[PDB]
Amino acid sequence: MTTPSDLNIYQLIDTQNGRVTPRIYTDPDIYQLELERIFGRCWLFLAHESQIPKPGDFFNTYMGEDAVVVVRQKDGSIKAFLNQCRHRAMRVSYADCGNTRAFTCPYHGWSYGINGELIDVPLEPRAYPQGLCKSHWGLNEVPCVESYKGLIFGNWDTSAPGLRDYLGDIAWYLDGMLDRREGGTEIVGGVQKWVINCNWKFPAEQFASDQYHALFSHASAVQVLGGDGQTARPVWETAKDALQFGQDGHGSGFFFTEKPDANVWVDGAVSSYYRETYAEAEQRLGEVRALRLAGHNNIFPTLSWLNGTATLRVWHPRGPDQVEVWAFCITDKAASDEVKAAFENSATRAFGPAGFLEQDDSENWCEIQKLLKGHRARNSKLCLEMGLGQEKRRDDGIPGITNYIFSETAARGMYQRWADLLSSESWQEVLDKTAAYQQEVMK
Amino acid sequence: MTTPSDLNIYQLIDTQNGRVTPRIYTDPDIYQLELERIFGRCWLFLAHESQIPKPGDFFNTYMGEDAVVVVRQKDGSIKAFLNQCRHRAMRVSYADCGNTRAFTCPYHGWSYGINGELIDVPLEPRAYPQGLCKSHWGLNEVPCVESYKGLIFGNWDTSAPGLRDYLGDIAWYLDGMLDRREGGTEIVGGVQKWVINCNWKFPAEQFASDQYHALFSHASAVQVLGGDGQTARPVWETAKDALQFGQDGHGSGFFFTEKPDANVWVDGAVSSYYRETYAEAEQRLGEVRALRLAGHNNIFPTLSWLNGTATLRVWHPRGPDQVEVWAFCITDKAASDEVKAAFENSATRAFGPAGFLEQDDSENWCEIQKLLKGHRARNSKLCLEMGLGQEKRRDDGIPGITNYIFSETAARGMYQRWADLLSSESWQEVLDKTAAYQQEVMK
Amino acid sequence: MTTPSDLNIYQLIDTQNGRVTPRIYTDPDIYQLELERIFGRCWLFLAHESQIPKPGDFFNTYMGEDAVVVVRQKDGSIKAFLNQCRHRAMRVSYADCGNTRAFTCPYHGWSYGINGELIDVPLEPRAYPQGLCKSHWGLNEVPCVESYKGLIFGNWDTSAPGLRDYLGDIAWYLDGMLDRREGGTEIVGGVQKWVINCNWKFPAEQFASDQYHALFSHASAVQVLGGDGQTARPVWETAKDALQFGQDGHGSGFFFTEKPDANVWVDGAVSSYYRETYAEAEQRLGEVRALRLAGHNNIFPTLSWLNGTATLRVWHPRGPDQVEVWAFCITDKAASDEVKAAFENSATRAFGPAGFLEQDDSENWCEIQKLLKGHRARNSKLCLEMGLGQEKRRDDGIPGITNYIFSETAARGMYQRWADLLSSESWQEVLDKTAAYQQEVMK
Amino acid sequence: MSAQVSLELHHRISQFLFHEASLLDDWKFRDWLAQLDEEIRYTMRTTVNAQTRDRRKGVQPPTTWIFNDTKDQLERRIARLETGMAWAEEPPSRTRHLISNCQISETDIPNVFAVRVNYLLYRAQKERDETFYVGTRFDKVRRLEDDNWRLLERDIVLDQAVITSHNLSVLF
Amino acid sequence: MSAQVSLELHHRISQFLFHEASLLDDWKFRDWLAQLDEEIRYTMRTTVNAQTRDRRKGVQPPTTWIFNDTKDQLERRIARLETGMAWAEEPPSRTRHLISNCQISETDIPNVFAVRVNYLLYRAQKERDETFYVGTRFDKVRRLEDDNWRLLERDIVLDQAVITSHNLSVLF
Amino acid sequence: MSAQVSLELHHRISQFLFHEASLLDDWKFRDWLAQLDEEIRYTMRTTVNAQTRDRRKGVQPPTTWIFNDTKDQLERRIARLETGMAWAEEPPSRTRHLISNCQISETDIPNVFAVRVNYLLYRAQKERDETFYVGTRFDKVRRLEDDNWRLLERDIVLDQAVITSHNLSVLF
């Protein structure tokens, strides 16, 4: 019922003029093609190395719509497997996290080791007189798993490029958060999970290239939150320079500030901790990244984070018109317990199902998805013309394509990457098309 | 994508022999083709001019599955717009009715005037250095909007014929209700909204050509209701002559009566008011229409009304197997407050979610839709052979094709119009096919 | 669109090597093709002759997704009709069971006799001046209905073989339960109905060829039950020889035991009754079948029963990922009231929504169906290699293809029959393919 | 506002309301009709959404009735079911009334007491039909000299702006 | 027609029922088993639809059990969970019992009281599973000389003709 | 275990809780804020699933906050709605609180009483939106010398491991 040929991906989006057709947000055939290609060939976030410290520790997560289990091995390596018994396809694990020595299927009793091999089969001599090859029937394994400074990503496809090459320039911005202090980072206190009724492209695009909405959507929160002396006005009011990076679908954005200051939504203790440890962060990275304590960042397809409040967000697609959000809080390992408690309170207050800020965003996305149900509604062009033609490469030492923070360079780049991945058979063709597009836009 | 060639519309319905295949009530491809063509090219009811008296007043309604806002302009005209912000497609209004000076999108802050132009764009010089053309990005507007004696209809397609030509003969029957007294009419007291799980064709066909069911479905209501002295027997028992008009998918039906009498379900005060003002109604229209205080009328696709109880009903399709009903009560403007209160009580008692009559009809439709889920159930022919071959044109001054009230002329005409609209590219081909069908059936 | 050409049935299942692709459990086009062919051309269980003893008695059941009414005629025959009024397609019966003289449509009032003819039409002379042929508009009738020793089956297709030929060898196993004593059997006390979220193929295959799971899934029930002290070890431990019959999609399985013993889940009174009546059962049938008071059976597509607890189970498909279970309890007619009460208590305790055994099975099926939602999950092969190549024909007088009880002969046969029926136009081609497959497997 | 009643009156009035609900659940409509007083008023209206400015002012879009009955119209509604030709009620619906948060207070008229409760009405019909109606409810109750209670008024509030059931054949 | 109990007895019996429900909600099955009396009878049946003529006569299609237990079978059901090999209750479900409309009456046998309530049982299990069971319930309670109460009987009514859950692994 | 209060205290505390819920339902947030005590603690946490061995030991996967407030943060949440620029609550939501199974006990601190109830919160917003939140709730209440009650603490339990609503803009 779904055919790649009948679909016209390039017809729906027009990057050069900046027009988008809303039919891409509601089409089931598009959704199945996405599940086959985009989530099949792109690196996806799995977990943090702090969550599986000792051998035998495991964590249950998702890739696309497929359940996956991540397990720490005896020699220190990390592996990821699909949750499916090779006989009748029943899951072998259900807990959120823990420690185990083998996974046992409850339906019939097949047992698998942590390395994935099939160790036990009940009544094998009677059931299989001809003999069974236990080598062939091991657990399905993710071929590519790799960790960047403590964040574990995984890929289904061997032909795809490595993690470092897939990241590219956005690694320079992620290093700003991940490498502030010696010792790395760690997660603090559990995971928050909830469900929103909107396509997965809405939050991804917003966390890629949207600072425009914070002026109007979050006016009430600014007015209310704006006894210790602090700057009531938000950082964007007094900022001198602003930067947005929009390349390969990876997006980032921040403001230039004289002093290291977090946003008004954080607690005083968190800002004090940030100010006290400025010398080490400046020495390790540099003045430009050290002074950045506010911004937005998104890694294609579905990893999002903000610099100030220290939150990680992962979106799992559930059908063409739903998504599930998992939210983590991450902080420096060397921080004391009190500072970590302050971080947890601040992040859970500002962002979450009951946060001051998330409510309006989720409401807007759900309203748009509800509207997109009529024939006339999803055949009208939408404007994407912010900052068109002003793209340039900075010479001050900041890598990548750069434009003003009030522009849609990253959104257009993400949509171009989406159209290229959806309409190409091989990764080499995708890379060639991306290079051609970059050469066109830069000149 | 969606091509009519793969479908066989003419195969499913056989008008000449009077057979119908139930697959038309449950097919999703048929539903999408209907949304594209029938609701795209046909005049649809919007509101009443009494609901938007002063400039700036607005009303929220639907066309097909698309939300629409109707607003009264300063010069006295009326305009209808689609509820969608041109930037990211978010709705700009949510209230049921009211008065306003501009519509503001809450997501980013774009503001539109009542005439639809884009007046305000926040931080435009910084966001759009190259410049933005505010003329191109106005609100989507319904090109054709027109009011007949105070009822507002709208059309998406410019090529379609005008409102008067689209109505034709059914205007002669609508004028019977609308032109009883000077001053026109007005709505009284709010709108009733509820949801039924059945295809939109069931209530439309019933209100087009079904008087047969009232004998058996509403037996209990007649027995119980059949207070002040009144004719216990309904009008149909003592009636002598009956008329049904079945042309162009527009259907109407009533009985001939010596005296002006409403049905047994109405209150005594309403019937007394009808009897007292007979001279003016007879003088303005004529004896035949003035004596009609009962019957049924439908306008293709989804406008229904009954003469006695003064109710207007609009059906909005929600998927192939659901519908949403909006019910209005309408009465003469010159009537005093007490008579209008009596009208409201009578209409809300007889018809509504809790009315004596509506319950059984909704139950029957839902049961039929539940049954239509099996392969064998939706491949068996259904009979439509009532009054076949007795069609003739009256010579007593009543326009249109006429048959006995216990016939299915209007249902067959509606299904023929449905099959013609669904399977034609241009309106001219539809008109030619309709003329050919009429010439065939009349001879 | 559902067409044989676009689909690839033979690609999905590989019987010779024993592999299955899970996509067959979740594909909607496969489901529609199944509804058209498998349930359209196969004999389906309707009722028991004990439930409709006297003329005019009726029972409401299902075939596929189509409601059907079974009625006992005055001359002693049995007829099954589709629940649909020939005018506008409304149901004519809603009660679970009872006695009636005619079926009346509530929407308009058409009345049908028990033989199905249309006897009454309200206001026919006025509604149908040209005349109506009541012969043509009778109730839709199932052409083929036949009863085997008191169990009523029905078929939609005339070209399909007779009931005896459709059953074949599985009749020899059904006769073990049905012909234990004179007088046949009868149902005791009502029907249990509930809903499970899984494909019908899961319970069908399990009740066809699955004894492996009882070792691990029902370990807790075995450990707890041992109602008082009895033979603690289940039958499978003491059993010497075991048999599984896997032919034509019909599967059966049991153990050889020295003494007539039911399973540990039954009550003591039931086993005592079996031991006391063993003599007559042995005389009527033979020692082999008389000593069998345990095992599993299945008749294609969806009839299941177990010998010990005397339960009948029918599965009605509701969409690609749901099923509805109806459970009956059946026992010998000559048994006294106390023994029948004991049977009812035992069956309702062991099997049902709240039974000790059914809970784990339903849980496993629902978990598998939940997992089958990802692209990667439903494209991985599953093993079907139990007992491969050991098929042989016994010479001790037991008909059919026979293998060890811990084998998947019947599952592979069922999947082959499914693939043959789904991909053939005529029954003769199906029979030829089945004969070819049997000749291949015997070599 | 008015002083809350003591323990005994609260107990007796709560038991009276429970008894009336149980009569409704068991398909005994003649006894339930015997419970009501001659001047019973049975009311329900519609629900609307308004602008922020309207809410600040207090203005609302116009509303309309759904139920508006006296005792005689309730008698007619009962007789319609009793005839045997009501296809909405064939087969009958199965309902449960759950009542909570009972607040009772005195009234200016002697021997009349005002009651406010919250209700959940669960309705299941035929096979695989389920519906929940949640809301609040206001009542007035009169006590006779023989220690018997009658219901004088009932005003019901439903929280659904667009009612999601095809009909309401159940008495609230 | 049996006289309703006074305030004190109503209060004490209501508190006893609430305590039993709280024990069930907190996964304390041994204390709950200690609550029951030796002659406990735990019953539930099925629901059917009948013709108009049958309803007028009083006849209905035949029904069958769903639960029929004594104390020993409840002990077995508890031990099955305690073993650790019940895959229906691994991981366990999370349930809430809501009880309302409590009516208490005397009985012919001394020191035995009859109770009728309405219940809503909410069950959520694993991730994204929710089920509501609404109905009525009849109980009998025996008071000991030391002011301790035991449960003698329980008969449960479920309003679903076709049960919409795959299994019932929760004690009502 | 915990000593149960008498009839009068149970009645008064139950009426106080009902009054607070009614204030919340009628969109009167200033009076509701006046109800709370200065040291109010408003808490909710997350729900997790654990292994059989962990449950036997008592260990669980780590959890995190959802609500953690004092009186000042509740004041801020009220003022945010009062500004008129909260698009989550424009138009406002329509809610009903149903409270049941009230158990009241004494506490070591004089004039402080512990309460446990079960709640169902029904939320309907815009057109065709409905949500049920079912759970349990623990409270502490302080009585003043002028026979007025204040709320000192509130800890809420939600039985959903994966919350199925896009946001929680309602005060539980």
Ligand SMILES: O=C(O)CCc1ccccc1
């Ligand atoms: O810089 C920050 O701390 C967050 C600002 C922001 C606002 C809206 C979308 C992304 C980031």
Ligand SMILES: O=C(O)CCc1ccccc1
């Ligand atoms: O004339 C009337 O008031 C009602 C008659 C009727 C009967 C069946 C369908 C529509 C109208």
Ligand SMILES: O=C(O)CCc1ccccc1
């Ligand atoms: O023999 C019996 O009574 C039951 C044995 C069984 C095991 C697994 C599936 C069906 C029947």
Ligand code: FES
């Ligand atoms: S289901 Fe896993 S071993 Fe069979």
Ligand code: FES
């Ligand atoms: S969503 Fe309307 S202005 Fe952006």
Ligand code: FES
């Ligand atoms: S619906 Fe059956 S006679 Fe018309």
Ligand SMILES: [Fe+2]
């Ligand atoms: Fe934001």
Ligand SMILES: [Fe+2]
């Ligand atoms: Fe009607």
Ligand SMILES: [Fe+2]
């Ligand atoms: Fe089993």
